[PDB]
Design an enzyme around this catalytic site. Structure first.
Site, mmCIF file in Angstrom:
data_model
loop_
_atom_site.group_PDB
_atom_site.id
_atom_site.type_symbol
_atom_site.label_atom_id
_atom_site.label_comp_id
_atom_site.label_asym_id
_atom_site.label_seq_id
_atom_site.Cartn_x
_atom_site.Cartn_y
_atom_site.Cartn_z
ATOM 1 C CG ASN A 1 33.460 31.404 26.771
ATOM 2 O OD1 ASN A 1 34.397 31.776 26.063
ATOM 3 N ND2 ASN A 1 33.558 30.369 27.592
ATOM 4 C CG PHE B 1 37.489 37.947 31.715
ATOM 5 C CD1 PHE B 1 36.820 37.256 30.708
ATOM 6 C CD2 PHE B 1 38.841 37.682 31.916
ATOM 7 C CE1 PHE B 1 37.486 36.315 29.918
ATOM 8 C CE2 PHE B 1 39.518 36.743 31.131
ATOM 9 C CZ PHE B 1 38.839 36.059 30.131
ATOM 10 C CD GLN C 1 32.446 37.038 34.504
ATOM 11 O OE1 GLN C 1 33.283 36.336 35.067
ATOM 12 N NE2 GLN C 1 31.352 36.535 33.939
#
Length: 177
Positions: A113, A124, A74
């Site tokens: 989120n 990601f 991420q």
């Protein structure tokens, strides 16, 4: 609108200053126009500064602050660099577009989120299918080349907060033909 409308974007990544390689992603502009546009603009920096943050809307120099072995990597937090920041080109966060695309295969690019309709700049890249994330995270792209640099980053030694020990930085980013 058409499949020929799909744009390509790149990320040149370094691990502790050493070039790991280039990740090329194909954006599904015909399926998720707002999400793909936001992402594309963040790679090129051609949208200016953040409405709420007043900081440059662009990935250059940001990091991959979280990596989960066997699942994903991420990044996208260009304001705080730890998962609590980031901003969309629309000002603040934006709504979830229809969940057309699914996490049905590895190397899919999806939006990170903090609950419904909280899309910012964080994203990601998965490394295995993840259908349980369908209808929660908007999938908008797919890695087309450089999937080995994604796994290289994914298997880096991390601390208890899942943050890589090494500095994983987006050296360059932008659009491809």
């Amino acid at each position: 609108m058409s499949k020929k409308d799909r744009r390509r974007v790149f990320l040149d990544v370094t691990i502790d200053g050493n070039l790991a390689g280039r990740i090329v992603m194909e954006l599904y502009n015909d399926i998720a126009p707002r999400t793909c546009n936001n992402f594309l603009m963040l790679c090129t920096g051609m949208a200016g500064t953040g409405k709420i943050s007043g900081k440059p809307l662009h990935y250059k120099g940001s990091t991959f602050h979280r990596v989960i072995k066997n699942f994903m990597i991420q990044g996208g937090d260009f304001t705080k660099g730890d998962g609590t920041g980031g901003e969309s080109i629309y000002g603040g966060m934006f709504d979830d577009e229809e969940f057309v695309m699914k996490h049905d295969e590895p190397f899919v690019v999806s939006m990170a989120n903090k609950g419904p309709n909280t899309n910012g700049s964080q994203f990601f890249i998965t490394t295995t299918p993840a259908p349980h994330l369908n209808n929660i995270h908007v999938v908008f792209g797919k890695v087309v080349s450089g999937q080995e640099v994604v796994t290289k980053i994914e298997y880096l030694k991390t601390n208890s907060k899942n943050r890589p020990l090494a500095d994983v930085v987006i050296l360059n980013c932008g659009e491809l033909v």
